[PDB]
Every structure is written in C-alpha cells, then in structure tokens.
Amino acid sequence: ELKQEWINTAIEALDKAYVPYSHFPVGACLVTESGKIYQGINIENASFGLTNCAERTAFFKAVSEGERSFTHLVVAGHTPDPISPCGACRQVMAEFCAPDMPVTLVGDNGVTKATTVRELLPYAFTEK
Amino acid sequence: QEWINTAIEALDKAYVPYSHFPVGACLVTESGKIYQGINIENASFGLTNCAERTAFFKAVSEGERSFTHLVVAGHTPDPISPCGACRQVMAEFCAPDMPVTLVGDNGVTKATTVRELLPYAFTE
Amino acid sequence: QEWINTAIEALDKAYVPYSHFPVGACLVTESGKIYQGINIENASFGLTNCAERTAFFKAVSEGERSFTHLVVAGHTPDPISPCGACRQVMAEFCAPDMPVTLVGDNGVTKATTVRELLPYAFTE
Amino acid sequence: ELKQEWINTAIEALDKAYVPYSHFPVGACLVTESGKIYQGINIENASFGLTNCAERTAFFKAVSEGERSFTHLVVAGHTPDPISPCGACRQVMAEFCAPDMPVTLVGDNGVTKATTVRELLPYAFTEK
Ligand SMILES: C[As](C)(=O)[O-]
Ligand SMILES: C[As](C)(=O)[O-]
Ligand SMILES: C[As](C)(=O)[O-]
Ligand SMILES: C[As](C)(=O)[O-]
Ligand SMILES: [Zn+2]
Ligand SMILES: [Zn+2]
Ligand SMILES: [Zn+2]
Ligand SMILES: [Zn+2]
C-alpha cells in the first residue's frame, strides 16, 4: 500500500517538471525514516550543465529540512523501461543512503524495477 | 529583517562536512512565501549544491515562478558573493531587476540585483 | 582573427546530439598557445560541459596558468553569452582585466572582460 | 607492458592536479582506439560544484579532439583502496564507452582493482 502511494507521488511530479529544453520529465519520491516524503522534479537551465535531476531535487529538499535518514526512493519516467537514475543522482544517493536502501524505478505501462543503492552504485566513492 | 534572519539562521543547518563553509539563502515569492536554502556538499566536490540553488529548487518544485527577493549569507568579512552557477540559476527564474541582498558577518550587507550580478545573461 | 577562426571552426566539431546548439571557444595563453574548446553534452543534461570550460580544462591540464584572451562563438544572432558557470571558471584562472571576445553569426562581435562578466566575483 | 605505462600516466597526473581546496589529487589515463592516451587531472573551483574530476577532464580533452572510441581507462589516487570513480564520472564514461570497456583503478602500495563500465554503472541511463 505504501509503495503504491510513493509511486503515485513520483508520477505526479511528472506534471511539475521544469523541462522546457528536453521535454523529458522525471519524478521522484524520497521516503524518510518517519515516512514523510519529499517530492523531486527535474529543473533544467538554459545552460544544460546546471540542470538538476528529480532525484537530487528530492534529496536537496529533504536535506535542507534536516533529513538524513532515508528508507526508500521511487523514481518515475515516461519511458519504455523503468527510468534509470543517472550517475550524478546515484552519487548523491550514496552520500545520504545506506547501500541496502531499496530503490523502485518505474516506467510506462506499469513497468517496474526493484533495485538498491548498492546495486546502482557498486564500490561507491564516499567520504571514507 | 526576517529574510536576513532566515538566511543567517540557515548557516547552522548547512551540510558542509568537507569545506566547513556554510552558506544560507532566503528566496521570497511575490506572494510573500519564504524558501530557505543551505549548501549541500558531496564527497565528490563537483556534485555540491549551493544554498541559493537549493532555495530555488525548493520553490520551483512547489510551483513557484514569481520571485521578488533573494538574500544570501555567509560567515565572511565582506558580504558573500554568489558564484556564477547560482547567478545563472537566478537568471533562469528571476527578472533582471529583482533585488539581491548579500550578507556577511557583523551585519555587513551589499545591495545588488540580478542584472548587476549577471550582465548580458545567457538565456533562452 | 586566428582566435576568432579557432572558436568558429570548433562549432562544426561540438558534441551536441541533444541540443544541436554548438559552442566554440579559443583560450590564449601569455606565451601565445591556443586551446580550443567545444561543448560536450551528456544524456543527463546536468553533466554537460561548456566549450569555455573544455578549453580551460585542456589548458590547465597542460600546466597553463597565464591566460590573455578568451574567444567564445555560437550560431547566434547576437554575440553568444557565456553562462555563469563558465564565468566562474574564468574567474578561477584569469585576471579581472583579461579581455573576452564574444562572437555570433554574420560577423557580430562583443568586446568584454572577466570583470564585466562576473562582477564582485566569488573567490578564494 | 601497456597497462603499466597507463598506470604511470595516471600516477603522473597526481602532480598536475589543481586541488587547492581538497588537496586530494586524482589522475586518469584514457586510452583511445589507436592507443594514443589522454591524461586527466582534477580541477577544482572555489565554488565546489564546478569542480571537474580527472576522469571527466580526460574525456573532455579526448572528445574535444574528435575521439569517440575508447579501449581502457586507468584512474589513480593516493588512497588505501583503489580509487573509486564518482557517479558523475561514471555517467560520462557511459556516454562514450562500451559497457565492456575495462577500467583499472589503483591506490597506495600498488593496490589495484579490475573493473568495467558495466560493473561501475549497471543499468546505465543513456540516450537510448
Ligand atoms: C533519470 As535522471 C535524468 O533524473 O538521473
Ligand atoms: C556564495 As555560493 C558558494 O552559495 O555561490
Ligand atoms: C555560451 As555557454 C552555453 O558555452 O556558457
Ligand atoms: C575518484 As573522482 C573524485 O575523480 O570521481
Ligand atoms: Zn540524474
Ligand atoms: Zn553558488
Ligand atoms: Zn557555460
Ligand atoms: Zn568524479
């Protein structure tokens, strides 16, 4: 039940995207230790390199409000296969999430992929 | 003063385990809503996000598109200077005439604007 | 003219499969050495690198630290504007007085400087 | 023999770093289809988010000179375990390199890790 709600939150973010250059929305639902969620949207810039992905938007929102303990991340796109977080997003994930933290990826027609931080970013570069 | 206080109080909440250089931001909408930003570093420095951009990403994620003021604060002898990446995100979302207040330690402030910080801006 | 030609000729070599918006750069050292930059996009747009920054990274990787001119070109009606991220990298490595020539289509040019593009720069 | 030369190139980049903020050098040796190499260095900025990693510096050098076919990447750091490319670097790797392209990571005391693009960035986000 909870996972279905998180998926709906990530999907709803697709209509909150700021993507006037790619027209490629991505949505995220980041779940905290308490179960409160932070929604992420893609936010582009005319200089493409300053674009901020939905996953990172969710982390920056949560971390700015003092969140440091995360239990799940859901990411959605309008894609034939489940949306894949880019490497920059995976690196921010690794800063704040345990390797075992589950990640649910969804795409068109209900396609889903169950994964984890450890699986998305093996041998991760960290403060360590 | 409330906007200055929001930016300064953010300094004690920043995620800066690598620089120990906190930056705070207060982004104000036309409706008067306040969005607070902090800098959020990463073990890979290039993935660090500035306080100004954190505030914009928060506000834009909640549908805000009309901004009337930005305050940026640091623990600096002179009023802190927004970096060029932050200025480019300001230009994406703010009118050139939108005022920007820069703050440092011991009450020092500098009044500026989007137009002055990023002249001949790269745009759409 | 050679510096302008280097920046314009880079436009046909850019890696821009997503924007199809090429940008070229020519970075000149005090010794007269030329470094050419192109923009290099990524499927994740946020990992895109601008032509100006490509030129700086090339030059700095070869030990260059003294820069006397930067030319930036685009296929634009007015002279192309460096984004704020590029301006911040210029400020890392260039004196405020270093001249910057901006170029667009049909011979349009704009003369500027690091100091004018990024006033009150965030620094060391 | 060739791999030892690439490792020396990546190690030599450690003395070409521009890292006045972290004092954490990273070196890279990117090998093209012809065997010509591009050396990468870490290049920091006072605004940390504009820092460019050694791996990406090597790719940007090579790609600016028309290179699009890469056969190996070596990365070096002064680290107890073999240096780990961050996720941003892995994402640029995936733009230009085949999943099977080998990656050699080295650290202090000759420690080495043999890996690949597919292993560093599974289920990679791409143009596809
Ligand atoms: C799937 As993405 C472009 O938000 O890293
Ligand atoms: C003053 As800043 C490092 O947040 O651009
Ligand atoms: C003019 As540009 C997109 O290289 O900063
Ligand atoms: C190991 As690195 C900081 O060059 O991604
Ligand atoms: Zn991403
Ligand atoms: Zn900044
Ligand atoms: Zn730029
Ligand atoms: Zn990296």
Side-chain angles (χ1 to χ4, degrees), chain C residues 10-93:
Chain C
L11 297 171
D12 297 302
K13 300 194 297 183
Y15 181 76
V16 289
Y18 313 108
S19 70
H20 306 293
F21 186 80
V23 182
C26 180
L27 177 62
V28 184
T29 70
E30 184 181 356
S31 84
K33 295 175 181 223
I34 296 178
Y35 291 88
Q36 191 182 49
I38 55 162
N39 54 331
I40 302 172
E41 304 186 327
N42 192 273
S44 184
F45 282 6
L47 279 297
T48 296
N49 201 58
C50 291
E52 296 94 306
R53 287 182 283 155
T54 298
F56 275 102
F57 299 158
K58 280 172 80 176
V60 170
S61 78
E62 310 300 341
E64 308 294 357
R65 297 293 184 277
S66 296
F67 302 108
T68 55
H69 202 115
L70 174 69
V71 184
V72 194
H75 284 309
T76 50
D78 302 316
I80 194 152
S81 177
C83 82
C86 285
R87 296 176 192 201
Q88 189 64 47
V89 169
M90 309 170 198
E92 187 70 16
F93 293 111

